[PDB]
Write a protein that binds this ligand. Structure first.
Ligand code: HC4
Ligand code: HC4
Lengths: 193, 193
């Protein structure tokens, strides 16, 4: 029947064991899912050489996912958009197939603890019933500072797919976007203001 | 009816006008196509801070495209593979759909002038009748050296797609792979041997 994900019990790719020991409680709190047959879930991590609030300024921009995500043609949120849970955005995906809008809802926004998350509620692409959470975490060693971003998701495995058909694809895209986030925010850090 | 591509008459993205003036003849020679209704073609460029032969060692590895390309699960070339024109590779794509092999044929391999190219001859994905050429070029200024890689393609626009539905997708993937090529070969350069 249903199971609970175990992302909080092993070191995810891109994280060191030292860093995992610090984040184990956070992974249990925000990156645990109850999962059924026909779904898959994964946790991805990315180290960034920038301060936490620099990274968070980009991660929290629900109306501009294209700032750090690939394969987005445009993103629209209409007239009276405010950054509040329950809001939606219309993402036009670069798919190589006809025009496809992904309607996505903001599920979480915590500026104090640096957690956000969203749900794909409509759209004919390869990520049905997709739901994901992103959290941002600061680290220090001998005066040096860095950030770790954790991003997890749950998603449907389409009939005819193997779980790995879907997990490898979703992992590749999330990982590519985190690499872009790292590049964009490290550049922001190097240039300051 | 048919037309000739004009990649050699404008500065492609990622190239400076100075660099274009040097490559104009090469773009005409290796990156020109005759194109019909229902096809699209593009030219992409990527600057790399590494010597030409360092970049070429990776670009020419027809049996290991995953060294610099994303979304490749595996690549197989069988028992008696030799790096000669006419050889084929079986690429398993990360698509988020069921298992899909891309059979690809090596069309060009010129180690003196640093040109290669391949054709997708079979495979149920979004790049039907795909054909591409990659060329590598060295630059110098006041003792500093760099490389420019040019990569162009022609591909079918599926029925039901607009040309931009296909061109934006193909451009995004080629551009992402060139960014990976840059990272991989700049790392190789920094570490020498
Ligand atoms: O390629 C697909 O099937 C879906 C891609 C996708 C990319 C960005 C999104 O916000 C949603 C879906
Ligand atoms: O996503 C697709 O439809 C096709 C992808 C692709 C990626 C690498 C290849 O070598 C061929 C096709």
């Amino acid at each position: 029947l249903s199971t609970i994900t175990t992302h909080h019990l092993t070191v995810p790719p891109g994280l060191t064991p030292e860093e995992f020991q610090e984040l184990s409680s956070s992974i249990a709190e925000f990156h645990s899912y109850r999962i059924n047959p026909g779904q898959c879930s994964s946790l991805l991590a990315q180290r960034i050489h920038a301060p936490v609030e620099t990274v968070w300024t980009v991660v929290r921009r629900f109306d501009k996912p294209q700032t750090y995500k690939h394969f987005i043609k445009s993103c629209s949120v209409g007239e009276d958009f405010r950054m509040t849970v329950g809001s939606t955005r219309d993402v036009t995906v670069i798919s190589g197939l006809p025009a496809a809008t992904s309607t996505e809802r903001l599920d979480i926004l915590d500026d104090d603890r640096h957690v956000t998350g969203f749900s794909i509620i409509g759209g004919e692409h390869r990520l049905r019933n997709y739901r994901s959470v992103t959290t941002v975490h600061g680290f220090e060693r001998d005066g040096e500072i860095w950030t770790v971003v954790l991003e997890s998701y749950v998603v449907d495995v389409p009939e005819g797919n193997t779980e790995e058909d879907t997990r490898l694809f979703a992992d590749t895209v999330v990982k590519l976007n985190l690499q872009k986030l790292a590049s964009v925010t490290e550049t922001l850090a190097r240039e300051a203001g």
